[PDB]
Amino acid sequence: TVYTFPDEFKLGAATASYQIEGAWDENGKGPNIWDTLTHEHPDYVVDGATGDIADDSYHLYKEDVKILKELGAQVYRFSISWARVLPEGHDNIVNQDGIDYYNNLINELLANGIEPMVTMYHWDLPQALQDLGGWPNLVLAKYSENYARVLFKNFGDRVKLWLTFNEPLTFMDGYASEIGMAPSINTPGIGDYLAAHTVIHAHARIYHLYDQEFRAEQGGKVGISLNINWCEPATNSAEDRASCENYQQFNLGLYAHPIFTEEGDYPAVLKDRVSRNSADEGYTDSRLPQFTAEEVEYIRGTHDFLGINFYTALLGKSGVEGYEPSRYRDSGVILTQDAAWPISASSWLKVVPWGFRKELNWIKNEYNNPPVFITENGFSDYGGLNDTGRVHYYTEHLKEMLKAIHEDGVNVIGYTAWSLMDNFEWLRGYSEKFGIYAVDFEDPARPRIPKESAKVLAEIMNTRKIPERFRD
Numbered sequence: 186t187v188y189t190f191p192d193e194f195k196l197g198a199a200t201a202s203y204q205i206e207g208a209w210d211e212n213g214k215g216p217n218i219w220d221t222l223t224h225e226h227p228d229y230v231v232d233g234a235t236g237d238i239a240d241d242s243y244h245l246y247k248e249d250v251k252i253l254k255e256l257g258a259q260v261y262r263f264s265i266s267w268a269r270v271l272p273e274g275h276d277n278i279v280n281q282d283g284i285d286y287y288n289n290l291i292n293e294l295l296a297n298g299i300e301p302m303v304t305m306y307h308w309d310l311p312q313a314l315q316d317l318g319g320w321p322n323l324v325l326a327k328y329s330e331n332y333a334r335v336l337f338k339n340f341g342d343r344v345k346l347w348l349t350f351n352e353p354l355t356f357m358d359g360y361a362s363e364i365g366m367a368p369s370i371n372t373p374g375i376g377d378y379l380a381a382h383t384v385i386h387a388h389a390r391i392y393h394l395y396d397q398e399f400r401a402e403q404g405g406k407v408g409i410s411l412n413i414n415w416c417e418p419a420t421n422s423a424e425d426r427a428s429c430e431n432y433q434q435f436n437l438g439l440y441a442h443p444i445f446t447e448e449g450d451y452p453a454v455l456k457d458r459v460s461r462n463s464a465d466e467g468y469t470d471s472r473l474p475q476f477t478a479e480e481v482e483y484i485r486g487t488h489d490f491l492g493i494n495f496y497t498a499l500l501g502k503s504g505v506e507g508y509e510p511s512r513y514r515d516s517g518v519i520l521t522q523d524a525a526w527p528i529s530a531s532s533w534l535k536v537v538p539w540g541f542r543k544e545l546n547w548i549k550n551e552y553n554n555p556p557v558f559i560t561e562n563g564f565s566d567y568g569g570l571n572d573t574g575r576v577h578y579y580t581e582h583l584k585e586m587l588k589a590i591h592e593d594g595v596n597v598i599g600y601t602a603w604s605l606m607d608n609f610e611w612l613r614g615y616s617e618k619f620g621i622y623a624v625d626f627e628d629p630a631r632p633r634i635p636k637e638s639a640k641v642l643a644e645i646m647n648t649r650k651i652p653e654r655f656r657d
Contacts, residue, residue, distance in 0.1 A: 191590065202269070214283065217266070229369065249606075252633050253605065256642060260299065267332055270336070301344050302560075305332065308367070310368075314328060333391040337403070342403065349408075349409050361512070384440075408558065412493075415540030428502055429501040449482065455473065466510065493560065499522060536577075548595075560601055563604060563619045566618055
């Protein structure tokens, strides 16, 4: 039984718009911040790669559905490109080609018995909105509401699973480095916190919009996808344990405390440590923005489930490091990775499957066992179809998740593998492969071909259990 998926549990695979679509300026699509980064700053990206074509899923979406059907996916998580739908960012112009494209994809999925799960914002902000400052400018919360209204109105009759944002912990870092994630602005410790603040407000406005304007008719669920690494105490000391709690609160709690707790607001440790550090550095005002009591009440409770992206673990020990100011320095933990952990093709990603179970338990206890949908989990290599490392990664992580469900009572409701196919891996270009299907980026037809991991995941989805040969 510990190896069998619950009957209602949903299994599938995930992608994101800029990573797969191409057609970056086709049929009225406006430019986004990743068009700008890859066009103006190819020195920031491995091989100077761009998403101009990527998997060409704008043209090849029927092929994506075909492979999802072959895999046996019950759910397909994908994102909508804001600037494909609203080319100017604002809602004055709706691009009918963009509406037609996502309707075509949704209708194709449903005709093939696959449920769509839609991420509204997966990092591809319209450049016109970044020109106002982007996420640090709170005016984007209302713009985000207006974007979501267009999405609910056009697609919500057929889409019943929504994520407002994907990994704001990551995309806020686009405001903490001059050479990093789009829009590549160097305001660490200041602009990244402002970006988080706007995202939380935007998420809450979108949830309330759904309640007010769409839920009665559409009957779907709205969540958010938050990434989090497990942080294992370097030693069993109380002080190293404290540092790991700081990590959870500074990385997951930054977003999940305001939304998923009864109290709301940011975690106390986040407010207190930033306030103290800001005072010590001579600022009149804390670098952490504040919610009013009315905002705390508006934001808390804005969820129907929690989306989690889980990949890896770190070791945490008591202490402080990093540049002043920065979120890492403010967090009061010294982070490392254990040399013994198996590696991937991504410097940050080590294979630590038991960390997944620990993280799921941390979330269960902190947030009172919310329904959790694993919206990403996956592994990188540099190429190859006989992807034994990826097969091991998935079978181990799925076993650890099933223990969390069956042994630990964690309410995990679904799981989408990152990714359906090799795609544009952001600053890593096409150099790091996360797909269960391989794609030849030198072939204009971009054929998708199954790796061993696709075959193993198909076997898992078909049998609804971990095969005997992968059990302990």
